[PDB]
Design a protein around this nucleic acid. Sequence first.
RNA 1: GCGAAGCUACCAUCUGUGGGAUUAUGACUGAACGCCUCUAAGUCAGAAUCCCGCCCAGGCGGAACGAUACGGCAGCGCCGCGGAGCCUCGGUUGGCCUCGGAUAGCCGGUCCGGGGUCCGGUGCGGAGUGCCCUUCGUCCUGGGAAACGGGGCGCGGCCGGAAAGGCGGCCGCCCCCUCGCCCGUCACGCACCGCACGUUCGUGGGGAACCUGGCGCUAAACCAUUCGUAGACGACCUGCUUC
RNA 2: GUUCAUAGCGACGUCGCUUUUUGAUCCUUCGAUGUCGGCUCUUCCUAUCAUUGUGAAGCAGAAUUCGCCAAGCGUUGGAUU
RNA 3: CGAACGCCGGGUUAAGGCGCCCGAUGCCGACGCUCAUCAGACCCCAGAAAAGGUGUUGGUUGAUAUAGACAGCAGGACGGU
Lengths: 345, 191, 139, 195
Amino acid sequence: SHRKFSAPRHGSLGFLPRKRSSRHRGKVKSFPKDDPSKPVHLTAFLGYKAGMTHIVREVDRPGSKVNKKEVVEAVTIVETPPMVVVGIVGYVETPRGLRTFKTVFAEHISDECKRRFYKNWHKSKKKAFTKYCKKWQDEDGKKQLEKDFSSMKKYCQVIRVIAHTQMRLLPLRQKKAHLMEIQVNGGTVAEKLDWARERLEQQVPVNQVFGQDEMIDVIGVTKGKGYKGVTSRWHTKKLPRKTHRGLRKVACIGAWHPARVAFSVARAGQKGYHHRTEINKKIYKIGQGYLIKDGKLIKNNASTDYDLSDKSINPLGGFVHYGEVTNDFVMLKGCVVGTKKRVLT
Amino acid sequence: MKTILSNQTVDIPENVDITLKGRTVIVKGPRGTLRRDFNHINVELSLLGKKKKRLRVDKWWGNRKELATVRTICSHVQNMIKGVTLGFRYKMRSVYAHFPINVVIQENGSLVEIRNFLGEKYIRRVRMRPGVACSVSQAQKDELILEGNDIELVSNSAALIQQATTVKNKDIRKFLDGIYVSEKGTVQQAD
Amino acid sequence: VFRRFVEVGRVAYVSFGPHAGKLVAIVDVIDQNRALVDGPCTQVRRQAMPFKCMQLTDFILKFPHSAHQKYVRQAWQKADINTKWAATRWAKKIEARERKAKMTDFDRFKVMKAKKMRNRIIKNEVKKLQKAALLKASP
Amino acid sequence: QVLVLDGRGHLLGRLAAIVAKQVLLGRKVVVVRCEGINISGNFYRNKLKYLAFLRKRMNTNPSRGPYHFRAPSRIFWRTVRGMLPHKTKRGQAALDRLKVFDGIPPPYDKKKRMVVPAALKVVRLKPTRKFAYLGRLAHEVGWKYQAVTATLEEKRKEKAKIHYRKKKQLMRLRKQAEKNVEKKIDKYTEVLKTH
RNA sequence: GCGAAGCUACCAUCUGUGGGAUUAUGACUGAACGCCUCUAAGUCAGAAUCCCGCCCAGGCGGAACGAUACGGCAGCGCCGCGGAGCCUCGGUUGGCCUCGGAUAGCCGGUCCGGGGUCCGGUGCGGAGUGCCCUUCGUCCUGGGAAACGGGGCGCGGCCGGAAAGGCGGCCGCCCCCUCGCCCGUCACGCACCGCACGUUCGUGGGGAACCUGGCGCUAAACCAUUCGUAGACGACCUGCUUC
RNA sequence: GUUCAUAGCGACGUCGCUUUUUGAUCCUUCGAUGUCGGCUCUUCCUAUCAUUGUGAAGCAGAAUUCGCCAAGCGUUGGAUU
RNA sequence: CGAACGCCGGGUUAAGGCGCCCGAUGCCGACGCUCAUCAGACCCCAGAAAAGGUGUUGGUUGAUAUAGACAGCAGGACGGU
Ligand SMILES: [Mg+2]
Ligand SMILES: [Mg+2]
Ligand SMILES: [Mg+2]
Ligand SMILES: [Mg+2]
Ligand SMILES: [Mg+2]
Ligand SMILES: [Mg+2]
Ligand SMILES: [Mg+2]
Ligand SMILES: [Mg+2]
Ligand SMILES: [Mg+2]
Ligand SMILES: [Mg+2]
Ligand SMILES: [Mg+2]
Ligand SMILES: [Mg+2]
Ligand SMILES: [Mg+2]
Ligand SMILES: [Mg+2]
Ligand SMILES: [Mg+2]
């Protein structure tokens, strides 16, 4: 016993149940805490991981060797078209947590959301949300429609907003939306609720919420690889050439008398397609897309303060395995969780 | 061994008005009001005398251990009477070697801010109890004045200063240095 | 606080045991935990009793520490302990309780008719009282 | 029927030995305000002991091990588990009668709440001995809803005072109806047989 | 020999995060023990520890919301019904609530919730008690208390309760009652001839069949196929309008 | 140990603990439990080598050493067998 | 440790026990000692001593205190020298 060359342990016992997740639009496990001071603002978005480019950067960091010089970095591009706000959900602080009090949707819900609810759009007769639209219309049905908002002011303590990405402004094949919930961190519950009622069915921009060099965390779902073996999953060490029955195994799974394989023993868990939240990735840039014909069609993107050139968003020949950016892109630092064409948050 | 009652005599001066609503003693005098919670001991506090103000502390059975408290209660009442007719004042002279200690008090006597303590560039900011104030003693070399009504909250505030100034990882027999309490006096001095 | 003390010359009620429901007069404390008691008036033999066995009262007496039976009786007959007790409300609360314990079947019937009619007179008169309460005080 | 017990200052075990017996017999007991249940002993020994319970897990998989609950309603439910024959269909139906709620649900706001005098801190401890609160213990170890309870419990206590002050008004009405008479004829019977 | 896409290297690059109770310790106040004390009650500072965040997985755990089956008969929700046979049984008045104290708390009460005041007390403005209560039905039949009525197929409005609420509270009209109670005259009702499971919750629960009125609803999954952000097989993400 | 019994050691004596050496015993296994070492990997113990926070010196600073809450994290690269 | 056995009904008990598992202390039982940041908890029986504690709670053999001591506060220590 007492291994005689003690080592740090392979893999993560914190990231242990390495399961392919039951969603790959990565949900938010914990939003930031709301706060009575600061004005009403959202906290979350969606994107689609387009590709990656370099950035040559002037660096002002006093006290480093890097200062006043020029640095090449690895930099991703996340296309974030504008969200459409649809719904409003209330949450009650109980001794079991946040109980979903009720939901209030808007009326003229776009068909990309109605394509979210079904499974076969071609088979179905589109009949979701017909008699709910009637609740807005019926004028004696209004009184118990806005009695919701009276309760929603009163008992609901956290209000989260349902919104989806538009799909008709993307190069993606799917043409289905992704619904979300976005907690609003405003002041009192009334102005959180009234700002939300003020801006239902509106194309909420990306740039209104985020800001440049706000250091911002990415939740996304990793690449998918499938049921791969131990030394490629856990990065344990290859057995040598001479070993019968192979090289990529683990030599000792347990001791004798704990007569049970422990849950720490490095074993072939499925690599990738898990859920991750990478923290602290600085936004560099947010750039708009393709204004109307005053200037007859401006591209003028990646046109920074030292170039002044007609350059595109996408590389010459387009991003590999994405397509073509024609929306507001959030240009992030470093390698970001997920494949190309993966929905981020 | 279950001795019968032992008692204490607390005579009260005319400066104050005392009032107990249970075992919650309210003492209200010239330097403000004060009240401390004696509500955890099983000791009967009653008062007697028209304007002559005699306060008896009483415990009937108890132990050697339980008859010990009946004087601590008697002595903590005492210091409120000093602390409400007079107040407490702590004089803290700042002992130092070569390296000069500069002290200001930040905002209205709450925060105490210590700079250039023994070449620590670390700003040493210690905040004070609710109900106590700080001052620097004028016409006097680097001695500090803290005043209040309660001997806990005053001396807690003095203690938070003299332990934030501690010479670490060096010999304490050299470096005898920091802010240190000198004299435990009253606000209305020597009276 | 502690309005009544155990005392040489305090009459004391008895709660549990052989000598229940009667009064003793505490002569003196034996030791901490029982005390010599004696009720000449209550026909209780001069003997000891534990402190948790008894039950303090609100009367006192004036007889000497460690006195004999006749000298308690002279304190007893002047004070009229037997008459002055029974017109107190905790003496009432015993007596009205022994009525309840000694009810018969016919007496629960006469209560039940008088428990109905007495409650119903109040029940409509409370309605009539709150009628005049809510009608006048709504202006 | 429904032994809606309070939780103000019972001791854990002394209440537990009474509930376990009274739930093996069929009487449904619902223990409410489970946060304020005391434990006799030190404030430090108990969070020393219950922490020492948290080490008690299974090496090879802690998922299949001693499920350490943290909420004080569940601390008491697992205490009653120890006192029943839980692995038999004699106790397995018994725990399904015992329901426990840390804090007070809306059906049991308003039904009157019994109190075991035999299991109280007032009776069962020499008062100089120290004591610890199971709600205090549970927030300090894991459970995160002490603040959320404290909001809701003030919400009903404020709501309770406005009612008792209003009900005490009602009781003043009937004793003014007492003082009005033509009832002593009926009260001759009532006084001679237990007023 | 160079080689795209694809997988990859600490051999490329990026990211790796704070709070609460405290131990060891140092004190503050202060008896024991006139003085002294970090401790006996009271308190304060305190960490790679411990616990929770943050992060991963989500229970024989739970919410909120969507839409819910035409075509020809059909099928489907509710709302009010009587009939009907089958099962899983457990119960035999309900209680619609101050907080909290213990070396203590309760009630009534001008003045400015408090001060003052007053009764209660081994708790009687009592959960050893309080309430619907023992009421078998009804007729004759007189006196109290009673003028509110009192039930309901009634309908309509309103707010009151979100911690697991559908439970509660008020009036307006709507047909009748003054027997909706107590004391008392009066006489019948099966009076089944000594005897067992009688009395209630209960017009319980679940299930499939059927007449009968009144209103509304006219879908969605899975496969097949296509994709391949995913794949051992499954699973999943996706396309599929008659443009 | 300049002086200093006890900061650091401690003769003569004595009281314990431990199961990583061994010894002693033969209770289990002879119709078999595959009995050295290395390699690979996991968890745990604390009687703590370094780290976090402290206490003490014959601790001025420097380096050290003596104890404390303490297993969270570490304890390598090779020639010879 | 009780106790030695055909099949059973009633009664009573032994060793043992009577918070809850689990039949019985749901007795207004008794006089007490002890608080543990490693409690303690019943014959063989399943974890430990020498040493020590101004933690208490007893007990013995002593000395000083009503020609007022132990403590504190107050004071003095001068003279040939
Ligand atoms: Mg480890
Ligand atoms: Mg969460
Ligand atoms: Mg694959
Ligand atoms: Mg080979
Ligand atoms: Mg040094
Ligand atoms: Mg090549
Ligand atoms: Mg390549
Ligand atoms: Mg300490
Ligand atoms: Mg957790
Ligand atoms: Mg052998
Ligand atoms: Mg053998
Ligand atoms: Mg042998
Ligand atoms: Mg024998
Ligand atoms: Mg039993
Ligand atoms: Mg001793």
